[PDB]
Design a binder for these strands. Sequence first.
RNA 1: ACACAGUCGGUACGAAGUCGACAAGGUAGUUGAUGG
RNA 2: ACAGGAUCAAAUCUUCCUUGAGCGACUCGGCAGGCAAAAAAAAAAAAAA
RNA 3: AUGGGUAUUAAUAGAGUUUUUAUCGGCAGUAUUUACGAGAUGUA
Lengths: 55, 61, 41, 102, 585
Amino acid sequence: KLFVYAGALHPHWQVPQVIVPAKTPAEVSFLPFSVERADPVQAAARIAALGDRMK
Amino acid sequence: KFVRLNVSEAQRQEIKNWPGSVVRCIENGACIPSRELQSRLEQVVGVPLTRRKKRAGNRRL
Amino acid sequence: SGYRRGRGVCRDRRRENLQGDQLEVRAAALDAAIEEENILQ
Amino acid sequence: ARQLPNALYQLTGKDVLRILSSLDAAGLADMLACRQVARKLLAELDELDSVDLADASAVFASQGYRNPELYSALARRAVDVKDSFDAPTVFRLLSGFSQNAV
Amino acid sequence: FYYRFHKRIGKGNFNRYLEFYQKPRGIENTLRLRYNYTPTFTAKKRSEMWKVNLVKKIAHATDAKQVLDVWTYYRHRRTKRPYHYLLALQRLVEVGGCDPTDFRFRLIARGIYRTAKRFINLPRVCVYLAKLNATGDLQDLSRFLIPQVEAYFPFQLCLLAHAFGSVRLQDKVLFAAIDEALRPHLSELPAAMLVKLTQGYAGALVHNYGLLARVSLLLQQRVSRAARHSGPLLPTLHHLLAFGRVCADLKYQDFGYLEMLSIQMQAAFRADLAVSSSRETFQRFSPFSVQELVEIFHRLKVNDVSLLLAALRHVQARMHDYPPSCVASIGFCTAQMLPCDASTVRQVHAQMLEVLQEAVPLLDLCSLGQLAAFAKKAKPRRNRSALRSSVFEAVEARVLELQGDGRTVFDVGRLLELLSLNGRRVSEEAFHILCRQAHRHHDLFEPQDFCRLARALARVKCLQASSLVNALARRTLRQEDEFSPRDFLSLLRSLTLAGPPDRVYAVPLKEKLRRKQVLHNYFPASQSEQLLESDLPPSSRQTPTLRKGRLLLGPLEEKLRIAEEEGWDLLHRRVASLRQLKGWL
RNA sequence: ACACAGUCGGUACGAAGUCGACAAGGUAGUUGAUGG
RNA sequence: ACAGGAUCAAAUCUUCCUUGAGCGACUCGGCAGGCAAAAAAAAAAAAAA
RNA sequence: AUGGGUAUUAAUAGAGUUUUUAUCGGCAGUAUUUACGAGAUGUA
């Protein structure tokens, strides 16, 4: 009456699986993070300055 | 190597022209093989890779 | 209704026992009718 | 209503009138059914009764289907068998005429 | 006793094992579980109660899904019996059939084949299978049917023949054996059983005129004598018309039988007109019976002028009781058969056309096509062209309302040809709908249907349905032998003129036409290369080229989840997972 | 019989019926307990 | 079994889907063969009349 | 052919039949086996 298998899935026709397809995580009603945006002019200056130094 | 050495001359030329390794691209799902290439691959691996079509001689009157 | 059958089910309703336990944890004819009302309450 | 024509041959004038009146009470307006039923009513004039004529007049008036030939045939048959009419039946017969302006 | 059962190591290979999330081939324990201790009362009752519950739940099931689920649930319970199989089949037929390829039904079919020889009433199983459309299983069972036909009852043999005919499966050995077995019993069979036997032969298209002549003689003799488990020996007008339709299907032109039928039908029409109280009208026949008679005579090309005139007279007398579809079919057949210059024929046809144009909104595609053909084949007194123009306009208006009617069978080719004729141009929407629907009818097409559809497409172009032209070209290339020289030549001309098909069909078609012309020495007064691998369709991969891309080979919460993912039904079973344990702790 | 071959225990009827049976059902004589 | 099903419908020669693995595979179903006789190291070697 | 009375190839319900060696002597008598269905809810 015992059935053992090396792999994740078993071949029994009429018995449910324990390893099942994954489901998307449930949504939440709160934002875990806050965001604050830099001024566009300063951001443009910084991006331009970094651009040549990198590449 | 088996595919290259057993396939026809035109298919060999196509294999040579193809960039990279054909078997690796097929396994990665980057290139679609030809019917002859698939037939040689099936000969190598012992099983079909697409629904195998058998030819019957049946006709409705 | 499946448990209040007149002839008596051969088996007790263990599902009801467990569900009711969890629920409680987590939080002459007219006289006979009155007694039925009491057991209902 | 659209399947009635396939069964017209198994019915009588009374049966067809009953079906038409029930549909009218339900609230259906399909002039094709009335137009098809008119032919059977006119082909079976010799068997209609006073209540049948009154019902036909009323149902067609309510539906709005107008056919001078049909109304003239109904009037002629009603006059022919006037002996079997009553006051409410006569009023029912004449109400269709009044409503249809025939 | 000692229950010897061991699990062995085996010869697997799991070093550097990779997990593919694919099931293994089979369960490890396949040896029979033989209990070595006697069961208790409850244990034995649970073991044996399937014999009750299976039939009870089959009866309670009101759907093929439920029936198959119950059978699958009890799949492992032995030992199934012929009455179990028969109850399953009967319930399936009553609920309304199922896919005969569903693996759950394949269990039943394989079990039936396994226990075929143990069935007492194998013909009942065969009838159920024919009704369920299990053509393959029905075909296999003939092996065991053949050596038992002489032992069955004649009505069983008649039902067997009807069942085989219903699925249009030809088994000439079986039909010959059935005929030999029924030879001594034919005279005493009821009219309904004779009709069943002949209808089976007609459906199988076995042209046993030796049987047809005997049946016709028997029916004539029984009618002459004329003038609840078995059924009456004496036939009725319905049985006569059924046998006549069988004769039309098998192309049996029995003029004596048709004379008898014409006399009987004329007498019936006379009696129906004589009837007076409006309750006994159509007592012996119906408008559908009249339509069937007219169709019989049209199909057999037997021009019984008196009978056709009597039918038209009856239709005129009581047309208010004639269904519009019956009117359309009668008009079609009568106009195709008779001249429209006759006064009575012309008057009746005019009235029928009036009623049909009146009832166009009720007509289906078949009736619409028949009406279109009849309105043009008629010869009206007034407004000959305007009548046809209005009929065509109404048919176009009605066709758009039947866009999704993917079930009715009709002559798309003839409808398209009528719509595109005498310089008339078809409406784009109606033409698109008709050419879209023409794909269903290709398996039903004759050589003349091929020619007519190609003609219609060529005329309409001179709009083009490239897919339809390609399908026509492929099918005619496959069925080249079916065509006469002139038919093939005109068909190829029309195919080219309607927008040339793909070269893959154009070239071999020319080769076939060339061979046919040589063989038949046919060369009309008015009258290429070898195939290249580049002309082959790119959907296939017969060229050596390699392309970037992929070959995609893929196309009550617990109960719902298991049904959605695993794909089977728990039924009364219940499932839970460890995720919900704290609700019970 | 695994048994110096014995000893102590040892299956718990029917519904296998059905014109069945508090709060919801989406009508299955189906269902109520359970978010990190 | 190309057996059943879908489709603006398939190169001759099925574009796909179903057939839990079309019963492990292929067959048979008046199939199958224990004993005698006659032979016979394992085996093989006689159609019936 | 303003088109299907229309052109081509029904062996079609019947594709069916007992070989070779061999002058002369010898065997070939019996048993088992397939419906472990509720024919039937009998042909509507």
